[PDB]
């Protein structure tokens, strides 16, 4: 009878279903048979969006799994993915699961992996890996997971070869990311380090500053250090921090480091941690030289740099945890803050229970400075993003009640709610209970 | 009012729904922000207290003044309708967008401060030349020639038909089209179709109407026609009987030839002067172009040249079948018999013959027209 008849029937069927759902007294089988026939006709004629819309208005999306062909799955799945962005929580979740089912039936595991990653369900990822028999596809999935920052410990039931398991564990650990970045830098010829002055292009501003005395402000030096760290991040070599001492002077390379004050020294040390990004072997060796400094600020900065270096890269030796756990217990607030932040940055989204156990007691210590507890909350949130672990949320809430009104006025009090929210990032419906609990907080913070 | 002009979707896509939802949310937020002002500090009705206070502040009796200059900072200089120049300032509701010489500014009655503007509904020159209703039927009622119907369409309507075709070619419509032809050639009949089909404003100018009796007047009339047409809207203004520029001499005008010459120079300036006239088209016709000033025709002021010849022996058939559409003529005579009656029967000749035949049939109150009526009309038309 033509496509227009089918389209008008689909619209009228949607309306009839909408009104019958409010009546709850009409038989469904007669409508279901016509809906199935309409879906088959639409599939045969590449009118996939109309079929998807009809099945959405009927809520019987399960029928899609039977009428999807090898020539029709791409457009259908793209339409489901586009619709999911308009669908809200519960509908979007069911739609994503059905799209994942269509994908597994269609044997395109990469898109299934992406959809499961959106769902944040590790069981579906495990099922996808089990269903895969191609080693190269498994390696690509490991690369994708490493990009997403999710640790997937390959169980022994997944691969029968130990060497391949080690190889994909290294791939997940982003070991080859540094090599790839270095290869790209070599290809573009961007190896040469750029000094902060080159970015500043001071020669272009000298038209009106010829009368300014050379006063090296500490803040200017800190800005220079920050710019130097940003520009030369991941290149392994720097002209200001690690440049050879090739000028007629036997003075330690730390001349610029000692020009900064306290927190400035910490920042200068963290610049070294950035410069050796993703390079664990050389980064640890270079930071070992600064671990011997008598300045507590330099030690804290070195710990934070160690945390930065292992950011996104996991080593089976776990140098970060072993090194930082010894400094976490130290009384000095600066060293404790540096160690905590390094642990949080290096172990972001890892969901390690050992870190939870080591950090929770710090949150309950009333003698700890506000800085320490705020950074502990931030690190706990970073480690447990999207996990909805009730224990960490309860610990942060307990820390929040125990604050006097005076502490609430400091800006640092605004970071504990930030950490608690970070614990709940990306999970919509689970946060209503926590909002209800938070309604009990003091008025100045409650909102 | 002009809240959102984006209608490019023109479908049931989610983008249109999202845009509408965002607009509704913004409107709701604005309404909520506005409502709280009265909820917290209404302080007045805001509906009639403001209007009443404005009426009691501004002079209740507002006079009919005339703005003559511009003073931005709480001031204005005008002349009292009695004559006394005033230094009336600007009021709160001034909305100073009509600050041009001539628009009456209404001042207060107590202190004579500017109270209100003067809505203007006159445009005397434009009104004494504005076409209210369509003159005749569609172009099909012209009949026979259509050598300029396509040409005139391209010259005027085609720019207004879909001005992307001339845009895609990288050019602007032709400057002007001057319709010159034999006396009674139907040039006015061409303007009839132009108006019945026209889409924009049209102005009619009697040819002698450009020459006034007082010296210096004619240039003023030309400048005023230009201002009215241009300042009003996109227009197609036809100054018919352009030969009357210097052909006919009248004793009413104080000036002699140097007055028609001045009027022609002013017309030329107004056609291709020193500014941007805008989107204005000109279509003029004349029956004696041999005397028209050569400068008023150079490509750049009057561009398209159109010549209208007498109806053709083949076109005479369509002309006759047209001008006698609704006549209850008896089959006694055949139009072809009078078709060749006149060696140079122009278009007006056919209409005159038909009208005379109708009148003759009327004198006897008969229902149809006989061959003898046409025979007696033909002699009375051509022979006089």
């Amino acid at each position: 009878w033509g496509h227009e008849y089918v389209r008008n029937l689909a619209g009228e069927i949607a309306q009839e279903y909408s009104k019958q759902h409010q009546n709850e007294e009409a038989p469904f089988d007669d409508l279901m048979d016509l809906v199935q026939q309409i879906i088959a006709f639409h599939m045969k004629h590449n009118a996939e969006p109309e079929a998807v819309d009809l099945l959405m208005e009927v809520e019987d999306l399960d029928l899609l799994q039977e009428h999807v062909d090898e020539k029709n799955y791409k457009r259908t799945c793209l339409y489901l993915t586009a619709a999911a962005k308009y669908l809200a929580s519960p509908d979007d979740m069911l739609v994503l699961d059905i799209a994942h089912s269509i994908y597994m039936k269609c044997e395109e595991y990469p898109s299934a992996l992406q959809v499961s990653l959106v769902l944040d369900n590790l069981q579906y990822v495990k099922h996808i890996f089990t269903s895969c028999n191609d080693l190269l596809r498994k390696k690509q999935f490991c690369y994708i997971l490493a990009r997403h920052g999710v640790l997937f410990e390959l169980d022994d039931n997944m691969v029968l070869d130990d060497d391949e398991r080690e190889q994909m564990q290294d791939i997940i650990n982003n070991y080859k990311l540094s090599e790839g970045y270095l290869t790209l830098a070599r290809d573009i010829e961007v190896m040469e380090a750029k000094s902060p002055e080159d970015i500043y292009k001071a020669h272009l501003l000298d038209g009106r500053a010829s009368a300014g005395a050379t006063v090296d402000s500490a803040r200017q030096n800190l800005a220079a250090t920050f710019v130097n760290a940003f520009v030369n991040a991941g290149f392994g070599q720097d002209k200001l921090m690690t440049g050879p001492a090739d000028s007629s002077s036997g003075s330690s390379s730390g001349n610029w480091l000692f020009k900064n004050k306290e927190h400035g020294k910490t920042s200068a040390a963290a610049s070294l941690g950035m410069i050796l990004l993703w390079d664990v072997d050389s980064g640890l060796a270079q930071l070992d030289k600064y671990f011997h400094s008598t300045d507590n600020h330099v030690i804290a900065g070195a710990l934070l740099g160690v945390g930065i270096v292992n950011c996104g890269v996991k080593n089976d030796c776990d140098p970060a945890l072993a090194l930082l756990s010894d400094y976490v217990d130290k009384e000095d607030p600066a060293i404790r803050i540096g160690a905590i932040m390094g642990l949080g940055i290096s172990y972001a989204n890892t969901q390690n229970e050992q870190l939870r156990s080591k950090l929770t007691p710090i949150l309950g210590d009333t003698n700890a400075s506000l800085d320490v507890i705020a950074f502990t909350a931030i690190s706990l949130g970073l480690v447990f993003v999207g996990s909805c672990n009730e224990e960490v949320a309860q610990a942060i809430i307990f820390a929040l009640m125990d604050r006097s009104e005076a502490d609430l006025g400091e800006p640092l009090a605004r970071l504990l709610p930030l950490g608690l929210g970070l614990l709940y990032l990306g999970k919509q419906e689970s946060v209503e209970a926590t909002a209800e609990v938070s309604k009990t907080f003091n008025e100045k913070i409650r909102k | 009012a002009a809240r959102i002009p984006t209608v490019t979707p023109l479908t049931k896509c989610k983008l249109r729904l999202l845009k509408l939802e965002r607009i509704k949310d913004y409107l709701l937020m604005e309404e909520e922000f506005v409502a709280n002002q009265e909820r917290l500090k209404p302080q007045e009705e805001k509906t009639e207290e403001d209007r009443s206070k404005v009426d009691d502040i501004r002079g209740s009796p507002m006079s009919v003044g005339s703005l003559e200059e511009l003073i931005d900072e709480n001031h204005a200089i005008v002349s009292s309708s009695v004559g006394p120049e005033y230094y009336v300032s600007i009021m709160s509701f001034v909305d100073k967008d009509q600050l041009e010489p001539g628009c009456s500014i209404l001042m207060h009655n107590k202190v004579l401060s500017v109270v209100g503007l003067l809505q203007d509904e006159v445009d005397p020159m434009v009104s004494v030349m504005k076409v209210e209703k369509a003159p005749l039927e569609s172009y099909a009622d012209i009949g026979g020639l259509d050598p300029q119907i396509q040409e005139i369409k391209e010259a005027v309507e085609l720019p207004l038909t879909h001005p992307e075709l001339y845009e895609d070619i990288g050019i602007k419509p032709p400057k002007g089209v001057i319709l010159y032809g034999e006396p009674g050639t139907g040039k006015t009949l061409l303007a009839k179709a132009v108006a019945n089909s026209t889409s924009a404003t049209f102005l009619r100018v009697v040819g002698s109407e450009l020459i006034q009796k007082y010296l210096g007047d004619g240039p003023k009339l030309v400048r005023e026609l230009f201002r009215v047409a241009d300042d009003l809207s996109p227009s197609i203004v036809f100054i018919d009987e352009i030969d009357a520029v210097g052909t006919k001499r009248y004793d009413a005008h104080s000036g002699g030839e140097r007055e028609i010459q001045r009027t022609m120079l002013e017309l030329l300036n107004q056609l291709d002067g020193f500014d941007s006239r805008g989107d204005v088209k000109v279509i003029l016709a004349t029956n004696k172009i041999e005397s028209l000033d050569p400068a008023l025709l150079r490509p750049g002021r009057i561009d398209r040249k159109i010549e209208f010849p007498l109806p053709d022996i083949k076109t005479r058939r369509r002309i006759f079948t047209i001008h006698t559409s609704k006549m209850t003529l008896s089959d006694d005579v055949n139009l072809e018999e009078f078709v060749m009656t006149k060696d140079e029967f122009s278009g007006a000749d056919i209409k005159a013959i038909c009208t005379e035949a109708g009148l003759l049939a009327l004198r006897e109150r008969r229902m149809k027209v006989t061959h003898t009526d046409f025979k007696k009309a033909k002699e009375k038309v051509m022979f006089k």
Partner: protein, 149 residues
């Protein structure tokens, strides 16, 4: 201003702060958390960043990733293959097999992908195992390709 200038020249143009991946479909929790922490610290500039906590900017470490599209052979070695790079186009609802990229320029080996730029292989010799060409892509030699001499 100096911090902003340094950020603009991050990695000399090789690293970005994009929290999204795979055509803006996947949100990385770590990068988002770092960026949100940095913004919340910036909310109170004078007290937080200009005070004793200049180091809160190091939460940005989580959000930085490289702009590299490196094609890799089965033997895990880098391979230079021409790649077409251009702005992505939403192909939903378009009849036929519309191209997903606006552009005909071909770039070999590691094209610096900008925000919104999508990549498609310019050669049929290699079948990309990834539907989206980003980061590490393992290329498999096409067994059906015949070199047209």
């Amino acid at each position: 201003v100096r911090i902003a200038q340094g950020l603009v020249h991050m990695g000399k143009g090789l690293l970005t702060l994009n929290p999204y991946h795979s055509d803006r479909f996947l949100l990385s929790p770590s990068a988002h958390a770092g960026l949100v922490i940095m913004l919340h610290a910036c909310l109170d500039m004078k007290a937080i960043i200009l005070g004793k906590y200049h180091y809160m900017l190091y939460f940005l470490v989580l959000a930085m990733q490289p702009r590299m599209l490196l094609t890799v052979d089965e033997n895990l070695k880098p391979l230079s293959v021409p790649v077409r790079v251009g702005q992505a186009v939403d192909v939903v609802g378009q009849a036929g097999r519309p191209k997903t990229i606006t552009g005909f320029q071909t770039h070999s080996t590691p094209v610096l992908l900008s925000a919104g730029d999508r990549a498609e292989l310019a050669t049929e010799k290699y079948i990309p195992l990834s539907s989206i060409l980003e980061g590490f892509v393992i290329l498999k030699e096409n067994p059906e390709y015949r070199e047209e001499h």
